[PDB]
Structures are given as structure tokens and as C-alpha cells.
């Protein structure tokens, strides 16, 4: 089986084009992930800045919990001023837990973006390696079809065939080309090669979809980070006051117990 009819030549031509288009279309699709890498890196910087900016609030909250733990040890954590202080600070405690949780979610999303991007890249590279080589195999038949005992129409079609598709490929178009070529004896020797090219295309493309979805979830977590970071910073002065007050309460109960022993 060489390509002897115009129909066989055209099905081979279209396939060779689509296989060669795999690397070009996938590079285009891959390049859409760079904006997501930039976004996640930007989230990480913003988180590091928020972590600095909230640290005085966090320090005050730690001081409060330290003093409360000591009041609980003394059996005096039911002191009405302690109770009042704990009420006053509970929203900030809750906001700190949310900041920790949403920042973690942002950072996991960041990790996942890079991982999906690395897989998209490797998928692209495998797809190109396979696609370019399978297209070369087809071109053996196409070039042979320019000469010999095929029809004049077969030879002319082979002469006309360009290396390149005029538009982007896709899972559907590549598969369409492969399926059309299933009818053609000489091309059928490479069927498994064609399959593996398509599988790598799918994998790369799916990884790019995962980058985009992951990055969208990341952004929504980051909005919550930004909201709660501001609430913590805003509470910093009242948290420092609360820490001093409960320290005083705790110190009074310490000295009452010392002086009573």
C-alpha cells in the first residue's frame, strides 16, 4: 500500500498537516498559562506582605491567649473582666483562623498551578516529539506518491500538499483526520503512533484547563485573604489594649494568690 488515488493522498495530506499542527496549537494553548503563573506568584507576594502587616495583631492575640491560659490555671478565667476581654477579642481570633485557612488555600492553589503547568509543558513536549515524527512517516508515503504508478491526480495532489495546516487543530479535528485515514492501507501501519499523539494532546490540554480552574479558585481564596487581613490590621490597636488589660487581670490574680498562700 502506497497512496495511489487522489482520495488516499488527500486523507494522508490532511493527517500530516494535523499531526504537524499539534505542536503549534499546543504551544499557543500553553502560552495562555503564563498569566496564571504570574497571578499565583503575585498572590504569594501579597500574602507575605499581609503576614507582615498582621503580625502585631497576631502578637497581641497570642499575649491574650497566654494570659488566659494562666487565668484558667489559677481557676480565675471566670473573672468578669477576663470574660469581657475574651468577648471583645473573639472576632479577631476568628479572623486570624480564617486568614490562616484562606492563605493556605491560596498557597495550595499556587502549588497546583505550577504542577499542572509543568504537566501541560511535558504533555506539549511529548505531543510534539510524537506528532512531528508521525508526520514525517506520513511524508514518506506522500513523497513516494509523487512518482510511480499512482494516478496523475494522486501525484498532483501529493505535489500540492503543504506541510502545514491553515488553522489550529483540536482533539476533534485531529481525531477526524485520524479516523479518515483509518480507511487507507499504507497509513494504517502507523495507527498506534496516531493514537498516542492524540492522547498526549488531550493530556496537555486538560492540564491547561486545570491550571485555569485552579487559578480561579486561588483568586477567590485570595479575595477572602484580602478581606480578613484588613479586619485584622484594623483591630491591631484594640487588640494591644486588650492584651495589656488581661495581663493586668492575670497579674492581679497572681499577686492575690501569692499573698494568700
Numbering used by the authors: 37 to 297
The authors write:
haptoglobin forms a stable complex with a haemoglobin dimer. Trypanosomes take up this HpHb complex but not the individual components.
Here, we present the structure of T. brucei HpHbR. containing the corresponding region of TbHpHbR (residues 36–299). TbHpHbR using higher-resolution data obtained from crystals of the receptor alone. with a total length of 118 Å. ∼50° kink towards the membrane proximal C-terminal end. the presence of a ∼50° kink in TbHpHbR. approximately one-third of the way along the receptor from the membrane proximal end. Ala89, Glu123, Asn124, Asp270 and Ala271 no longer forming hydrogen bonds. hydrophilic residues around the kink site in each of the three helices.
